[PDB]
């Protein structure tokens, strides 16, 4: 209801950070499972 473009940019930043951190999480799980 206030500066919708700022809210959309925040949502995009959250989305890209979430994708980055989730793929990092998957890579870390692959790494430790391979170590085991």
């Amino acid at each position: 209801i206030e500066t919708p473009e700022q809210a959309k940019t925040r949502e995009r930043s959250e989305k890209i950070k979430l994708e980055f951190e989730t793929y990092l999480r998957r890579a870390m799980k692959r790494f430790n499972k391979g170590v085991h």
């Binding site: 209801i1 206030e2 500066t3 700022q6």
Partner: protein
Amino acid sequence: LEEKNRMLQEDPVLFQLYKDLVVSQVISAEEFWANRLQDVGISAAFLADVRPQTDGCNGLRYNLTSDIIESIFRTYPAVKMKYAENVPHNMTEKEFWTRFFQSHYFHRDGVKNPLLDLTALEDKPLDEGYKENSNAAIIKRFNHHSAMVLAAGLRQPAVKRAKLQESIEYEDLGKNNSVKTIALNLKKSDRYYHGPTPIQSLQYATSQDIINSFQSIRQEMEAYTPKLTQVLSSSAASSTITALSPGGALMQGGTQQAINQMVPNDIQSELKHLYVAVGELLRHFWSCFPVNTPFLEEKVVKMKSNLERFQVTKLCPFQEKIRRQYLSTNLVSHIEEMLQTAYNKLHTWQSRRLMKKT
């Protein structure tokens, strides 16, 4: 007391007048204030017009105003319930407004029988043998809001017969009396021909000698020739100039005196204050007059006592202040005239009352 003090502060001259009338014991505060002593309709545009002010520097200026909230409460009593059930404990007011903006509540995008009972308009109600949801919701809530606004605007066979009579009657084939006037015809119209002009000694001329004079002048001017030298003379011209000369009889009076410098501006302002005070006192006196009830007698007696007290406590010091400067202006004379006129009026009315009783 606090409200009265604030109101007096809003008018310092009255506050000064109130002080000069009460502290000087001229009048009591009860008698002082004895004579001394906005709703907005519901508009349907209070929602669409009112928007969250989105100032460019990411400013969400709500501009929360009491009238807007009152209009919302009147139109939507549910909002009043939500406000009363949440603040100040469950949630803050601004957070509630923000939730209202984000909620779907904001971003939503018969007494008369004959012509209202649509269910009863048909005498054959047999059985059924002989984004639509969004649109329906929008229509329903719009109708609800309109009904709420209409209701907030306010804040039997006889009825049916009256409605039918109103509906059927034709203004053309009725009555058109419209004669709500009273004619006037005075008795003697000659009163206005010679009106408030007093009687004048409009003397009539003599007997037929008047006709003789008329014939004489008629013959005299019947053979007339224009003249030029006889029109005026220097001696007559000199007399006319002298009459028109400065200081002449036609030039009545002459130069005058600067009254402004003769009286100090402080004395002038105090004279204005005394004028207003005496004027209001005498206005109340004349409002009481004429005394048609026994209660008015005591009120006018108190008025005279207040006038006497005010005169003694202010004008006499004011008279002394003027007299020390030896001002030649008789400003006090006007006040004395008014006071004596009122006192004589009251004394004469008392004399009349005594005469009527005896």
